[model samples]
Target: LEKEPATLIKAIDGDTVKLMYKGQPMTFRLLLVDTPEFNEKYGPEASAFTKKMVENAKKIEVEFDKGQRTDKYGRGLAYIYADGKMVNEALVRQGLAKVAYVYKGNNTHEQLLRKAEAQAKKEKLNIWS
Candidate 1:
């Protein structure tokens, strides 16, 4: 399913998730990004946002880049999409997550992530108060 919405079972912090897609328990790492600590700044808000945005959806879409496969934990590194929109990018843009480039695979979303961080800092989205 290309652009479908997946029902989100749980938000693993702000950057990871446990979801049910196609009748299977799927764990995924939101590629190209990382969020703050659970007790740090807006961590709770970020996690809540993620849960509110995706839980109990009819369907969910996932897109993956070909390079730099899964992480050591076996979760696929992918750009998650829901309802035709980029959820990972949304989190970053909303100042809920930071760009975490762990490998040298694809940096397509790097610039956007950087911009998000800058905006977050400037606006004090989660860092200052």
Candidate 2:
């Protein structure tokens, strides 16, 4: 998968972002991690974390998996990167998200994210606690 340059239009939630790519606006459901909703536990912090990272990033990019491109909600599915770091993995490592929605061959960072979640769980971080 090639990293496509994108501009952050808005962070809808911890795992969702509105982005401008190739002069088109698209909402993406971030791959590999799922965070709480705004009304759920640790929701505010997760949203804030994603928003701050995207807002502060000078560079943002996306890489779509080899599988499905769009989810049932019509949102694109992909991995998000900010300043060369993978936001999905960071969220897991930081304990703001849990590794979910795995599709075996479709998910590129399955093991990596699972490992991060394991550490976060072991450390008793956020939702794990």
Candidate 3:
């Protein structure tokens, strides 16, 4: 459900987050996007951006596709949404992240994400500059 609240424990990086949900610790890997590594030029900026956007939200809505929802590391692959917007796509649109499609799917948002990334690159947002 989109109305449930999960407390954020910490962000592992720009693309992963650890949180406490229903009395259990859970880790989530943001689906459909990848940001630079922590040491990469835009890494810290991306991570900070994600933290600023999601860290203090009392409730987060998570959506999961049916296929390949978990990685080998047991982290859940999810499309995170907060305040009614897709967080992964937002990152891509802002050029703070790149598309990372680990599983094949309908790719409903692929085109929009690409367009957004293109605009970001054109504008030199984040590391593209």
Candidate 4:
């Protein structure tokens, strides 16, 4: 909560995760990674990828990008870090996700996120190719 370190509760979808913020349950939608749905074509695979990414993570951190919460006043936009590495970029690098919901300015991982997506695309991984 409040952009503080949280614990990995579960994965809702490829782009969303459940965590304990403060003491209550809070959901975070990962920024820079727009993943597929579990019902659609490659959705299940992407969902599994995210779940596996944090399966053993005893620690999860929701770090802010610009203001942490998105301006839409709905779910907060954040870079989810499980264990130590960033899950957002991991999804893209593994080709389980796409770089999406990007805001033109104030994006933290703008440059690096695009690069990872391109790498996955060129390599023809999961959702890529």
Looking at model 2, the pairs that clash are none
Clashing pairs in 1: 5-59, 5-60, 6-59, 6-60
lDDT of 4 by residue, 1-129 (tens): 234688777778888888876676777788877888889767888888788877777777778766547546566678888777888999899898889878755477878889999999999998876
TM-score of 3: 0.83
Candidate 1 lDDT over 43-67, as tens digits, reads: 8988887776666445567666657
Q: Which structure among the candidates has the greatest TM-score?
A: 2
lDDT of 1 at 83: 64
Candidate 4, RMSD to the unseen true structure: 2.4
RMSD per prediction, one decimal?
A: 2.9, 0.9, 2.4, 2.4
CA-lDDT, candidates in order: 0.71, 0.92, 0.76, 0.79
Q: Alpha carbon lDDT of residue 53, candidate 2?
A: 92
Candidate 3 regions with alpha-carbon error over 4 angstroms: 1-5, 21-23, 106-108
Q: State the displacement of the C-alpha of residue 19, model 3, in Å, after optimal TM-score superposition.
A: 2.5
Error of 2 at 126 (Å): 0.5
Candidate order by TM-score, decreasing, is: 2, 4, 3, 1
Name the 10 consecutive residues with the lowest summed lDDT in model 1. Answer: 1-10
